[PDB]
Amino acid sequence: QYYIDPTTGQPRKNFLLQNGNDWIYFDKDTGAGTNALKLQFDKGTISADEQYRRGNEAYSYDDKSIENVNGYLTADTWYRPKQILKDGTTWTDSKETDMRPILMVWWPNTVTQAYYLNYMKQYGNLLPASLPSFSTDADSAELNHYSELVQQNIEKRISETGSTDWLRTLMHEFVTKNSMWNKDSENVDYGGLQLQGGFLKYVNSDLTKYANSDWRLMNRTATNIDGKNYGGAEFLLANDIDNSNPVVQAEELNWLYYLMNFGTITGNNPEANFDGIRVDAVDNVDVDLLSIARDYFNAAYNMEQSDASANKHINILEDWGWDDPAYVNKIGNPQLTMDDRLRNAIMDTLSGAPDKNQALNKLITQSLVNRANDNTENAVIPSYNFVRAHDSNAQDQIRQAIQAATGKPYGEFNLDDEKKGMEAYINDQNSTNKKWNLYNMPSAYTILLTNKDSVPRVYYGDLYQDGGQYMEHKTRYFDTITNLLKTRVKYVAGGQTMSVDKNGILTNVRFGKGAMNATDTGTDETRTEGIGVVISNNTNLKLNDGESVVLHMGAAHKNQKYRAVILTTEDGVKNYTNDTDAPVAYTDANGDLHFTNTNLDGQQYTAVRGYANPDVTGYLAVWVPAGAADDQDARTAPSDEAHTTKTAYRSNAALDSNVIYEGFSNFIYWPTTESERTNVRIAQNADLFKSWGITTFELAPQYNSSKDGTFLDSIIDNGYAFTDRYDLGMSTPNKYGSDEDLRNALQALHKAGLQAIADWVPDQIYNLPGKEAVTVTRSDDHGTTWEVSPIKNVVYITNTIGGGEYQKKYGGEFLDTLQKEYPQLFSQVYPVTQTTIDPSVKIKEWSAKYFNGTNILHRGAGYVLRSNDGKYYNLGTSTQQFLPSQLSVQDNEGYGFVKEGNNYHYYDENKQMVKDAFIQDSVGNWYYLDKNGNMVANQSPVEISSNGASGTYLFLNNGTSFRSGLVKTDAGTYYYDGDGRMVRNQTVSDGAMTYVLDENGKLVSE
């Protein structure tokens, strides 16, 4: 049973003993003896190589086991191996927290494997710094050695750090350096409205069925209702809402109702609702939305009944396309079109530099209205107009100034950078030669605010400096533009004429309330109303001797004293806010005012000539009748008379009596004190706005910013880039204040008699935190397939699930009230979808099925893992269960140690019989397959070369190579060393033992 040395009580372990014809083997652990001849190979034995491959297979197909999205794997997937290469040395059952990167054991091809090896060496220090780079010509047996070496090194570092945080960072840095896993494979392109460098459209697939849609009707704008034309671009920014899906349409109506009742709903406060909407991004959404909004306002407010009804809810469109006005008029002018022809006329003739401005005649004709002799009402398409807006000649130039002032890439800035750029911007604004600011602002606003048949919109950043706390600092134009605004209320009314003379000088007249043509004699109030404007854009203007400029003030204004409102001087302008001290001019018997190159009655600045200063490049003079009462008001109230046409607004004296104020800039700073909050300040200044004749205050969009930095909107947090549509400063303040500050602002505007506009932004939503696998195609801004992209019908990981708590709370929640109060809204058929909205499903959380697509996300065409034949790996959730072979169980039949006849063989990974080779099992035993592939197991010394000269080996009957032990035979005792080779002619130590072996290997002593 045990073999002890009676002179040392020491047991011999791992000892092979001949006793007559019997052989006894005394084992390694306790020296317990067994019949050596009956030792048997363990049928369940597996090789060290096999152990290695099995250790690395996935522990299971559990969602917990393998990081996935809708069952799909990504380059960033980590998983739970069956075993973990403990400290790079000991295979040990994984724990559920033992997540390992799939890229530690799998690569899409040998080049990426080579690149991984190079990267882990160079940036990971997971291989010797002095190892040569691996080239695409790297041998696989070679790649695989170093790959295992790297895994051994990852596991040693985890043993040392107790962590994989570092390995997450490192592996993702590697991932993002592979084109197939970054923007390089996404065909980045900024053409058209690819503002963020490209789009991916969502398409139906059996692979991502939960993201399918029956809708996604794209580009169905005013010019493309039937989808047979091109339309406006469906795709603009972020996650594009599918506004063609009738369920989404019902949700847009729900949201609209929320905005229009915001004060009642969120504060039980009937003075804190919005009164109108701005429809943002009109030409990037299904034009059904304009009809849905109209229909709601008709049901709730009876817009089409009369001007008095419609004008209580002034709505506007952000509709850039020049074919849109005709369509807006045809559907009943439910929201006012802009007049982009007219704004461009101003841009082309006043706002450019002296060497750019064109002939002023364009102001007369390039518009929805021809203003040569505008002597009628209710006869043109009603519209609003503006010189600037938060994103029209503001945000681009302000970024140009920031870039120039700081040197940073366009569009990249911190707040310090913003302030520096603003300083440069305002300095430029105050210069005669402007790089980033429009020219002739006084003349431009004079045109804006004296035109007939227009609702003018004043821009915050022309009154106050664009960047700064709200209303922190005035522009150089504040006095000028507010003078114009107050003068508009007091004097501007009646018919208009515009003409440009032989000298290129524009004469613009309004006759005053009660007079439509120059020949009208007017009513009682006409005499001291009206206005006359002289504008040139010619900085070198010089009238010859005897030449003149004549304003035809008209038959109501014969032999009348006029006084100046604005005159141009060498260095700027002079404003006169009333009659006191204002230079005077008299009309003749015909109502004509005459000006020349000579001053009137010794009054400086009453001659006409060209100037060039920070205000005026050309000439500006504006004149009104002297002797108006201080309270004169030339506006017209809207009539209650029933409309005889299907329209909300009508272009007439009452509509013209309105002025919109776009009361924000993108570059308002976040407040440092509660008192700096925009909406607190708006509440404090309602009477001021009223004094300028503002009748509706356009607030910024109030949605809390997503703050994700993916577009200017979510860099300066203006409210156009948001995750939660219903969160208006509610979860936390927006840039303008809390929801209570917003409601107090609405209540204050109302107290002063002003309306308030909600910016309705149905086009998109940003920064949804939940990942979703979706089949997509790289496309342009119209959803047209990007022909050279390999991303066609490819599963891609999108960020499409979420929408915030207020979307959850309020989503679809007003649909019941709507159907009860206004059932007509639910039977209306819309022209694009050709069906009704669908309130049967409430949207409380967004997902891909409700989106047309997304901007490209820079994850790479190949981010979602697929085999070489194009089959997607999957846990089985969304498609066939399928994993990389490195992660799968294999059929071991005919592989590894296989008995055949009276012999054992070993078949390698190619199912090829191994010959003349040593193989180690998973528990450290060594076996030798002979030159015929037969395992040696005959317990007889045998000569084998493993590399050089032959060594003498001995294999027990179970096939194991006998090593580090004695063999005692009747003819002598021999010692086999740790390599399994007989030792001859030397003295050796084996732990506590020292053995002396003679030249035949016989033990001489121990």
Ligand SMILES: [Ca+2]
């Ligand atoms: Ca869209």
